[PDB]
Design an enzyme around this catalytic site. Structure first.
Site, mmCIF file in Angstrom:
data_model
loop_
_atom_site.group_PDB
_atom_site.id
_atom_site.type_symbol
_atom_site.label_atom_id
_atom_site.label_comp_id
_atom_site.label_asym_id
_atom_site.label_seq_id
_atom_site.Cartn_x
_atom_site.Cartn_y
_atom_site.Cartn_z
ATOM 1 N N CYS A 139 -1.812 -52.318 48.994
ATOM 2 C CA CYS A 139 -0.587 -52.595 48.253
ATOM 3 C C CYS A 139 -0.699 -53.796 47.327
ATOM 4 O O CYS A 139 -0.002 -53.839 46.308
ATOM 5 C CB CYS A 139 0.584 -52.825 49.212
ATOM 6 S SG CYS A 139 0.576 -54.435 50.005
ATOM 7 N N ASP A 1107 -14.732 2.523 48.484
ATOM 8 C CA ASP A 1107 -15.905 3.255 48.050
ATOM 9 C C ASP A 1107 -16.088 3.085 46.549
ATOM 10 O O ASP A 1107 -15.137 2.833 45.811
ATOM 11 C CB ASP A 1107 -15.795 4.722 48.451
ATOM 12 C CG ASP A 1107 -17.118 5.426 48.411
ATOM 13 O OD1 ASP A 1107 -18.103 4.830 47.933
ATOM 14 O OD2 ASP A 1107 -17.198 6.540 48.953
ATOM 15 N N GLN A 1108 -17.336 3.213 46.110
ATOM 16 C CA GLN A 1108 -17.794 2.674 44.839
ATOM 17 C C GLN A 1108 -17.865 3.753 43.774
ATOM 18 O O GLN A 1108 -18.021 4.934 44.084
ATOM 19 C CB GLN A 1108 -19.157 2.019 45.017
ATOM 20 C CG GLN A 1108 -20.058 2.824 45.906
ATOM 21 C CD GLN A 1108 -21.200 2.010 46.441
ATOM 22 O OE1 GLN A 1108 -21.384 0.859 46.060
ATOM 23 N NE2 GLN A 1108 -21.975 2.598 47.339
ATOM 24 N N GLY A 1110 -18.656 6.397 40.891
ATOM 25 C CA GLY A 1110 -19.627 7.455 41.065
ATOM 26 C C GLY A 1110 -19.422 8.268 42.320
ATOM 27 O O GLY A 1110 -20.217 9.175 42.594
ATOM 28 N N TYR A 1111 -18.393 7.954 43.093
ATOM 29 C CA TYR A 1111 -17.967 8.712 44.257
ATOM 30 C C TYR A 1111 -16.615 9.315 43.933
ATOM 31 O O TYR A 1111 -15.814 8.708 43.215
ATOM 32 C CB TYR A 1111 -17.822 7.810 45.460
ATOM 33 C CG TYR A 1111 -17.523 8.490 46.764
ATOM 34 C CD1 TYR A 1111 -18.543 8.935 47.580
ATOM 35 C CD2 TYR A 1111 -16.216 8.720 47.160
ATOM 36 C CE1 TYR A 1111 -18.273 9.538 48.775
ATOM 37 C CE2 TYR A 1111 -15.936 9.332 48.349
ATOM 38 C CZ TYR A 1111 -16.968 9.741 49.153
ATOM 39 O OH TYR A 1111 -16.697 10.361 50.349
ATOM 40 N N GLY A 1112 -16.342 10.489 44.477
ATOM 41 C CA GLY A 1112 -15.100 11.151 44.139
ATOM 42 C C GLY A 1112 -13.877 10.609 44.849
ATOM 43 O O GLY A 1112 -13.192 11.360 45.543
ATOM 44 N N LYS A 1113 -13.584 9.316 44.690
ATOM 45 C CA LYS A 1113 -12.365 8.766 45.273
ATOM 46 C C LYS A 1113 -11.136 9.401 44.651
ATOM 47 O O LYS A 1113 -10.179 9.749 45.349
ATOM 48 C CB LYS A 1113 -12.312 7.260 45.081
ATOM 49 C CG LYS A 1113 -12.997 6.460 46.144
ATOM 50 C CD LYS A 1113 -12.857 4.993 45.827
ATOM 51 C CE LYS A 1113 -13.161 4.729 44.362
ATOM 52 N NZ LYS A 1113 -13.699 3.367 44.143
#
Ligand SMILES: [Zn+2]
Ligand SMILES: [Zn+2]
Ligand SMILES: [Zn+2]
Ligand SMILES: [Zn+2]
Ligand SMILES: [Zn+2]
EC number: 3.6.4.-
Length: 1834
Positions: A139, A1107-1108, A1110-1113
């Site tokens: 202080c 899921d990534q 190129g996958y049929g999500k």
């Protein structure tokens, strides 16, 4: 003695004093006038107020003053900490935890008013009356004194009688006294030294008492200072007494976070400014240029002495590491071996700032910006140990997640408790009057007895139960039963110093001629003859229990009457040892009998050091079971009296243990045998040391000191000679020949080992070495001649055989007379015996008996878990037990001591079994919180926005949190001779706590509370992060078909579609997931962790697919949409809501144009679809417009738009500026919470609303198509809106840690965790800690969890994963390999060949880039390194040059375009750098000559031959072609030196000279600066030699590559006498292979080369290359093979290449156009890589040029073509990026046959790296290789 003389080095007459209580007891014993304060109070309560004191050293000291005053005079004075102020959150949390002030404020500027904010946010009124006030360091600082004047407003108003300040010596003290005189306060400042008050720390700080003016004609501060400076008493105890032991659970933890932090992980500054000073120091004190502590190369390449906390040394900087070396060398050459003398360095100060080598026991000032270094430990001062040098006692401290910097702040900006206690006691005594006494004693005493009488009942009624069954009586004599234990000890004891007290170190190494075990990681600088360690390891946790079952708990000594010793000495008098004296004998026998008689040794703990040991404390002694590998034994030690001078004759002779008990190997019991006494009888004998053997460089020579220690020799053997009888009296037959073991470290590298001899056949090996005394002068240190070499601890003594004179050190002399001394004669004693010894204990052993008797609102009572009854002696008993009634013991401030005195009881108890599983009542009342066990945290208000807190609710929250039931309760009593103590858990309190932390929902579910208790819990040393595994989705049956889609589902999407259907169906499944909220409570020393939990079942339909691309999500989710259609399974509904049967998709903006086109490509037309892009479509359609629509897809920006929030508030009935924010933080979350509370009412009222908000009504299904993209502002939008089923789709699922899993689960609806902001990473904590209220940031530091409470939440997160998260990741396709290998064309092959050896010459690997100040030293680096152009490192440049020939690729102004035409530029430019080298060497010689003449203008060197000159001797040696110079290299040096200045003589002025001296003056600055110039010139000579040698080599090889008459002529210049021939890689030395292999082996060629040559350098001249064979001139051979391969593919496939070097990629892209293979380059645009990848994947361009690190689907791609191996650092990252991209092409969704191609060069670093990858990748992870077949295709 005078105070300064006394405190320079510690007084030997002041008793050793390290106990803070004894400090203050002596301080009160000093002045007996302090009772005047008791009188002038007359029963009142003193009123203290600290400000910014940091750690409340005031209150610590004042408590100890009160306790001391009671202890002497039997007078009690109380004091009430009225209020404290502190600003920093962790500081105020520390204060609140450790002291509990009733008032604790934020800032001092506020408290000049009628009210202020406390730390919590209560805003209580300022107190108004104090009696003593203390400000602090923080202080006292119209802006500078913002705090100081703010505190002065308080002082002026309230007029406190006494005021004290504390700060640094360098402060405006006169201005302080001016500001005080402004408001009538008498002030006087004085400086006082911490070392002058009892503590060996060295700190000087300035104090000033204050008091209102006109109290008298006297000036009070002057008398105050006179009294204070009287209160001085110097240090007498070494700082080693304030340090914790090294293998201590708080220090070994400190080592472990260091190692672990290093296991997770570049910042290079140049210390060139101080570097010259370091070498100047080394040159001045004649220290060598060695690095003997840690041989350090760069920032983090060092290697300590195996015991030196090496993971700290790795983290320092080069300056610090080198300064450690300079310090150890200065401390050497003085007869002192650092690392074996206990001392401490503060190495942050620059060189020559401090004298150094100070008194060892003392410690320097530990400033906040410190980097201290304990010598003998090898590591930094731990913060907990820096707090104990401030007098603070560290046993009962509570620390919760503090750094070492944050804690060094506290420990440095502190007040030494002894100093502040002295200042307070003098202030109070002098200003005792003027105090405003109350003087009403009896009315206060009545209330005192009222409080005690009510609490004596309150504690006695806190325990319920105790009717649960008592258990069988335990007897302390559990001696229940041979050498299998003693060898379990060896297999379990410590093997790497870094093991500590329970650790396993892999790959232990054990030495020969000495058994020093160390781990293979941390070991090898003190290296000595290792061999792997044979034995296999038992855990010490399992061993210690078998050991505990072998031990008693209380023991006593039977024999040792008086006058039995008086006949023990008689037999030794009859024997030849003799009794020296009787005064010492009397003084010893006395203090031995008061140690044995009336003492019951109690078991305390077990030491897991390299030898296991047990310790038994008594009132006046200690006993230790040593359990050595050979000869285990008991040793007894007697404590000397507490009030004894340091140089005491009694204390000295009571330093070594006094009695001995050989454990009988035959006897199966531990305690058995005779007791041998170490009678004190010093002996004088004469010895004959002989030095024989080979001479070796001495210890100082091995360090490399350059003074008289330049070369000094010492023998390798020592032949010791003793007299016959003078040998026979000593027990061990110690005369022989001792071989030195220089690799085996010790003090001064002195480990001599006894040769194997006769008749000492079965006995431990006896070593002879030097052992210092941790303190004191060099002449104290002696030769030990002992039997053990273990690194000991403070307070442990070595069991030695005979000491040697202290004036031996070393030598090389033949033989000499020396005096040996031995003082302890052991004598047998049969009369001694060691003897062991209706106790009960109420183990409940019925987990249901408690649960039955448990009742709601029973939180007041503590369910009894344990009771005990044990017989004690009420006499000589201690005060923990209470006579008459139960005394509670507050764990937070007395638990460690309490449970340390109960361990002799606690370790006979059995572990509480039957309690591990948890069971309790069910279907418990919900939301019925206790509001006493768990207060409701206050509502936080928001209003540039500052997180404001509600003062009124804050005060109740404060009071409630202050008054909470302690979850464990311990009570003790001693009614009648039988101590009874009980332990109780407040089970319903734990259950009520866990109930609160579980937010309510509109569910038809009722929770169940339960509780469990686990013993044996131990604090966890850090382990790395737990990785989260996602289960596969293949083991299940496949759904049949979608019966609607026109295209099949590829048999790996069916198995996941069935999984999505089965959960939205949810057959059975009353509930799916059980949300568990646990709360815990630790009882550390006993070890129980009692945890109670609340479980809520919840049943939810959905999951995350993760899921990534190129996958049929998309396909699988449209399938799941088609299946459950017109099937109204979801039952519940809000009583007012607009629920539809539609389904909603949330997808980012650039992916939305996709989704409807895939319904169109697939089935289409089987349900109505609406896409919405942009806000002006939501305005377009109403509710009945949006009706009869099955699938809706939204862009994520619809929420981010602000007109959406305007419509939301409009339908929320909020003001139009509400919910209008631009930052989207925690404040906007409340702006949502209130709005969403409004929506239910608005939709409950009452269509075709023109502009609906999505959040108001409910869906059948919501699918978050990317969860990681959604920004922090728009995530909150998608977390609210309701739906019957919850799905998350994501290429990357955020599953990295708990804070990432919780984000998914919140979308799901589960509540698997609660916030605590103590679990994330150091990074992640900050981004949330900027949003914390100033009180929350304080509350975080207040409570901390167990690192098991986080692991259990990790397990629950994993359990969430295994139910709701699946992942499809196992050979999809034929994955074949095609290793293509090059032939080197030598048109650019030779261009390559010159690089690696040019770089070998310049020995430069990477371009370092750091802060250079010297304009003439940085350019000489930027030019020397400039040859390795356009690159970062040698490997990168070599790969670039093996891919393509070019000098350098950044500068395209000149283009070689051909191989020989590039070699032309190579020769030209390399001659250019050669001329640059000679011309920097030009200006440098001129500057050297000018600086040489700067001595000459002053006139000579003060003598014709004052000293040899470095520059002068460099001339006339570099100026002849005689020796140590190249055959032709040095002939070009004369051409450059003579042209400036001729023969050595004269030529003092330079022929050109611009500045004769850059240059105050020292005449030695310029002297040693000329020396530095000489060193630089020698350097430059070396690069010139390399530059020309490599030039000759390369021109030679280019001769053969040209193949002409010159080639054959210099071919026949063989110089080997012969006319197949190999060439040296360094120069043109074509001498035939037949002799030149032997030349390269012998490392010396036929020439007068010049430098040593390696046999791997040789190349065959016929094997360089054949010319005109292949036209490799247009581009790189790699590029033309690339053209060949990509031509060789069929036209219909796809190709991608990687181009690991983007610089090379520029040339590859251009050269590919030569083959005309149309390509994409993956560049030329920003953010248009979306169009880059949409191109040629919508359907053109075949080949792609990737980057190998720059989520997209590569399914069109078939062939990968790596184009050279990738260069990367770690095998982990190599395989990560290698299996990645191997994954990018054939991940899934591919109907091709993936081919992997490599273009590598046969004789090149690329194969040199390929082999390193292959030969190591198969071993680690057992990586699956792919089949290798030759690519024939087309
Ligand atoms: Zn180690
Ligand atoms: Zn050794
Ligand atoms: Zn409760
Ligand atoms: Zn020959
Ligand atoms: Zn040569």
């Amino acid at each position: 003695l005078d105070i300064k003389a006394a405190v320079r080095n510690m007084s030997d007459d002041l008793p050793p004093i390290s106990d803070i209580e004894a400090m203050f007891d002596h301080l009160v014993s000093r002045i007996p006038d302090i009772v005047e304060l008791v009188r002038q109070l007359n029963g009142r309560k003193l009123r203290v107020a600290t400000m910014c004191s940091g750690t409340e050293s005031p209150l610590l000291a004042l408590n100890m003053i009160a306790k001391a005053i009671k202890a002497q005079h039997g007078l009690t004075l109380a004091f009430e900490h009225v209020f404290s102020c502190e600003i920093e959150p962790f500081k105020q949390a520390y204060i609140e935890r450790n002291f509990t002030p009733p008032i604790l404020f934020r800032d001092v500027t506020e408290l000049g008013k009628k009210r202020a904010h406390t730390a919590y946010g209560s805003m209580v009124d300022v107190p108004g009356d104090v009696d003593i006030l203390i400000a602090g360091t923080s202080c006292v600082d119209g802006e500078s004194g913002r705090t100081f004047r703010g505190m002065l407003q308080w002082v002026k108003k309230h007029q406190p009688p006494i005021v004290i300040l504390e700060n640094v010596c360098n402060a405006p003290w006169d201005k302080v006294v001016e500001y005080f005189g402004q408001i009538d306060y008498d002030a006087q400042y004085t400086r006082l030294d911490t070392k002058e008050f009892y503590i060996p720390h060295t700190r000087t700080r300035v104090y000033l008492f204050a008091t209102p003016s006109s109290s008298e004609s006297d000036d009070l501060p002057e008398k105050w200072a006179q009294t204070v400076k009287d209160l001085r008493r110097p240090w007498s105890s070494p700082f080693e007494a304030f340090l914790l032991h090294t293998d201590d659970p708080n220090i070994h933890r400190a080592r472990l976070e260091l190692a672990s932090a290093r296991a997770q992980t570049r910042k290079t500054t140049d210390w060139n400014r101080c570097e010259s000073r370091h070498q100047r120091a080394r040159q001045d004190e004649a220290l060598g240029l060695l690095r003997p502590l840690t041989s350090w190369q760069e920032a983090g390449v060092c290697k300590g002495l195996d015991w030196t906390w090496n993971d700290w040394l790795l983290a320092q900087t080069e300056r610090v590491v080198d300064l450690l070396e300079i310090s150890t060398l200065r401390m050497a050459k003085d007869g002192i071996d650092s690392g074996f003398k206990a001392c401490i360095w503060n190495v942050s100060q620059n060189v020559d700032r401090q004298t150094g080598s100070s008194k060892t026991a003392l410690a320097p000032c530990l400033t906040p910006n410190m980097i201290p270094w304990v010598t003998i430990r090898g590591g930094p001062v731990t913060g907990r140990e820096a707090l104990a040098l401030q007098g603070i006692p560290v046993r009962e401290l509570l620390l919760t997640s503090e750094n070492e910097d944050q804690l060094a702040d506290l420990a440095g900006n502190a007040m030494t408790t002894t100093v502040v206690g002295s200042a307070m006691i003098a202030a109070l005594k002098v200003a005792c009057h003027k105090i405003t006494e109350g003087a009403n004693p009896e009315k206060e005493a009545a209330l005192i007895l009222e409080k005690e009488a009510v609490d004596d009942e309150q504690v006695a009624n806190r325990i319920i139960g105790e009717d649960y069954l008592e258990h069988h009586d335990l007897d302390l004599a559990k001696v229940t039963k041979l050498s299998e234990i003693l060898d379990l000890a060896c297999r379990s004891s410590r093997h790497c110093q870094c093991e500590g007290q329970s650790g396993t170190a892999p790959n232990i190494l054990e030495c020969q001629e000495c058994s020093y075990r160390a781990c293979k990681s941390c070991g090898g600088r003190p290296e000595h003859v290792y061999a792997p360690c044979a034995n296999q390891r038992v855990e010490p946790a399992e061993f210690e229990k078998r050991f505990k079952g072998l031990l008693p708990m209380r023991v006593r000594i039977a024999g040792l009457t008086d006058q039995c010793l008086n006949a023990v000495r008689k037999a030794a008098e009859k024997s030849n040892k003799g009794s020296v004296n009787d005064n010492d004998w009397q003084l010893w026998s006395t203090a031995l009998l008061e140690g044995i008689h009336d003492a019951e040794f109690r078991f305390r703990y077990l030491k897991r050091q390299s030898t296991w040991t047990a310790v038994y404390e008594a009132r006046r002694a200690m006993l230790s079971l040593v359990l050595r590998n050979q000869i285990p034994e008991w040793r007894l030690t007697i404590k000397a009296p507490a009030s004894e001078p340091n140089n005491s004759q009694l204390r000295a002779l009571l330093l070594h243990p006094v009695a001995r008990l050989q454990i009988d190997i035959a006897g199966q019991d531990v305690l058995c045998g005779p007791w041998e006494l170490c009678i004190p009888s010093m002996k004088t004998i004469d010895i004959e040391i002989t030095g024989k053997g080979e001479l070796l460089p001495s210890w100082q020579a091995s360090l490399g000191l350059q003074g008289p220690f330049a070369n000094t020799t010492r023998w390798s053997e020592v032949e010791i000679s003793l007299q016959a009888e003078d040998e026979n009296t000593l027990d061990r037959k110690l005369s022989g020949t001792y071989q030195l073991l220089p690799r085996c470290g010790q003090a001064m590298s002195s480990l001599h080992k006894k040769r194997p001899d006769l008749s000492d056949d079965g006995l431990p090996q006896l070593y002879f070495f030097l052992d210092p005394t941790r303190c004191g002068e060099s002449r104290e240190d002696r030769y030990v001649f002992s039997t053990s070499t273990e690194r000991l601890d403070y307070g442990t003594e070595r069991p030695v055989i005979a000491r040697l004179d202290s004036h031996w050190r070393e030598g090389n002399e033949k033989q000499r007379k020396v005096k040996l001394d031995v003082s302890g004669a052991w004598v047998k004693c049969p009369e001694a015996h060691l003897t062991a010894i209706r106790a009960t204990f109420a183990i409940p052993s019925s987990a249901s008996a408690i649960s039955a008797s448990l009742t709601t609102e029973g939180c007041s009572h503590a369910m009894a878990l344990l009771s005990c009854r044990v017989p004690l002696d009420p006499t000589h008993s201690e005060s923990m037990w209470r006579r008459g009634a139960w005394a509670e013991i507050d764990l937070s401030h007395q638990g460690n001591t309490t449970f340390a005195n109960l361990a002799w009881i606690t370790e006979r108890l059995p572990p509480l079994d039957g309690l591990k599983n948890w069971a309790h009542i069910a279907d418990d009342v919900s939301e019925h919180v206790c509001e006493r066990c768990a207060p409701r945290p206050p509502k936080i208000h928001w209003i540039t926005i500052i997180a404001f807190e509600d003062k009124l609710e804050a005060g109740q929250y404060e009071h409630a949190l202050k008054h909470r039931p302690s979850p464990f309760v311990v009570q003790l009593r001693l009614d009648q001779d039988i101590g009874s103590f009980r332990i109780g858990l407040n089970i319903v309190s734990l259950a009520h706590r866990a109930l609160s932390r579980l937010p309510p929902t509109t569910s038809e579910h009722k929770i169940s509370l339960s509780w469990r208790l686990t013993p044996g819990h131990v604090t966890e040393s850090p382990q790395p992060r737990r990785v989260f595994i996602l289960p596969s989705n293949k083991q299940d049956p496949e759904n049949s078909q979608p019966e609607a889609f026109k295209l099949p589902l590829r048999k790996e999407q069916l198995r996941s579609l069935w999984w999505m259907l089965e959960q939205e169906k949810a057959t059975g499944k009353t509930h799916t997931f059980v949300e568990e909220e646990i709360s815990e409570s630790l009882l550390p020393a006993v070890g129980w962790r009692a945890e109670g939990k609340a479980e809520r079942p919840v049943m939810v339909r959905g999951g995350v697919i993760a899921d990534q691309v190129g996958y049929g999500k998309t396909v699988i989710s449209i399938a799941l949409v088609a299946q459950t259609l017109s099937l109204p399974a979801p039952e519940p509904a809000t009583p007012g809501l607009i629920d539809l049967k539609a389904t909603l998709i949330v997808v980012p903006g650039h992916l939305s144009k996709q989704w409807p086109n895939e319904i169109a490509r697939f089935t289409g037309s089987m349900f109505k679809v609406i896409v919405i892009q942009g806000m002006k479509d939501l305005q377009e359609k109403t509710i009945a417009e949006l009706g009869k629509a099955d699938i809706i897809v939204m862009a994520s920006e619809i929420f981010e738009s602000d007109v959406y929030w305007s419509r939301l508030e409009y339908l929320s009935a909020q003001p139009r500026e509400w919910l209008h924010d631009t930052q989207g933080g925690r404040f906007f979350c409340d702006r949502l919470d209130a709005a969403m509370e409004s929506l239910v009412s608005q939709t409950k009222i009452l269509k075709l609303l023109p502009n609906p908000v999505l959040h108001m009504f409910r869906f059948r299904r919501v699918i978050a198509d990317e969860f990681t993209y959604l920004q922090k502002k728009s995530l909150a939008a998608v977390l609210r809106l309701s739906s019957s089923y919850r799905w998350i789709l994501s290429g990357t699922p955020p599953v990295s840690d708990f804070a990432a899993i919780r984000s998914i689960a919140t979308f799901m609806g589960i509540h698997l965790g609660v916030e605590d902001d103590g679990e994330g990473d150091v990074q992640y904590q900050k981004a949330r800690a900027k949003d914390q209220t100033q009180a929350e940031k304080f509350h975080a530091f207040r409570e901390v969890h167990s690192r098991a409470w986080h692991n259990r939440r990790d397990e629950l997160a994993q359990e969430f994963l295994n139910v709701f998260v699946r992942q499809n990741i196992i050979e999809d396709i034929p994955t074949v390999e095609h290793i293509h290998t090059f032939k080197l064309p030598a048109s650019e092959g030779a261009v390559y060949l010159e690089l690696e050896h040019h770089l070998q010459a310049l020995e430069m690997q990477a371009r370092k880039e750091t802060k250079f100040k010297n304009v003439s030293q940085g350019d000489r680096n930027a030019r020397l390194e400039e040859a390795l152009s356009d690159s970062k490192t040698a490997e990168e440049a070599l790969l670039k040059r093996c891919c393509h020939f070019t000098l350098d690729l950044s500068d395209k102004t000149q283009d070689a375009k051909s191989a020989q035409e590039a070699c032309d530029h190579i020769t030209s430019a390399r001659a250019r750098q050669l001329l640059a080298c000679q011309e920097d060497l030009s200006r440098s010689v001129n500057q050297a000559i000018a600086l040489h003449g700067w001595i000459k203008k002053k006139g000579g060197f003060s003598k014709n031959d004052d000293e040899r000159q470095p520059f002068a001797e460099w001339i006339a040696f570099s100026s002849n072609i005689s020796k140590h110079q190249g055959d032709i290299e040095a002939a070009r040096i004369l051409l450059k030196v003579i042209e400036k200045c001729g023969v050595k003589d004269g030529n003092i002025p330079p022929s050109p000279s611009d500045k004769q001296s850059p240059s105050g003056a020292k005449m030695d600055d310029v002297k040693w600066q000329l020396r530095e110039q000489t060193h630089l010139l020698r350097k430059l000579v070396k690069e010139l030699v390399a530059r020309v040698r490599s030039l000759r080599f390369f021109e030679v090889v280019r001769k053969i590559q040209k193949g002409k008459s010159d080639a054959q002529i210099v071919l026949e210049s063989s110089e080997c006498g012969h006319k197949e021939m190999a060439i040296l890689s360094c120069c043109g030395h074509v001498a035939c292979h037949k002799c030149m292999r032997k030349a390269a082996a012998s490392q010396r060629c036929v020439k007068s080369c010049q430098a040593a040559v390696r046999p791997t350098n040789i190349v065959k001249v016929s094997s360089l290359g054949v010319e005109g064979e292949l036209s490799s001139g247009r581009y790189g051979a790699k590029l033309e093979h690339l053209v060949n391969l990509i031509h060789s593919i069929p036209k219909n496939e796809r190709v991608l290449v990687f181009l690991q070097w983007e610089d090379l990629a520029g040339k590859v892209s251009e050269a590919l156009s030569a083959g005309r293979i149309p390509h994409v380059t993956l560049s030329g645009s920003a953010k248009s890589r979306a169009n880059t990848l949409d191109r040629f994947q919508s359907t053109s361009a075949r080949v792609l040029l990737l980057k190998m690190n720059d989520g997209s689907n590569l399914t069109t791609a078939n062939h990968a073509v790596f184009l050279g191996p990738l260069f990367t650092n770690s095998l982990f990252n190599y395989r990560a990026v290698e299996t990645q991209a191997i994954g990018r092409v054939r991940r899934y969704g591919q109907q091709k046959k993936v081919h992997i191609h490599r273009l590598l060069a046969l004789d090149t670093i690329d194969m040199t790296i390929f082999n390193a990858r292959r030969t190591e990748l198969k071993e680690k992870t057992d990586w699956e290789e792919i089949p290798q077949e030759e690519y024939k295709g087309r």
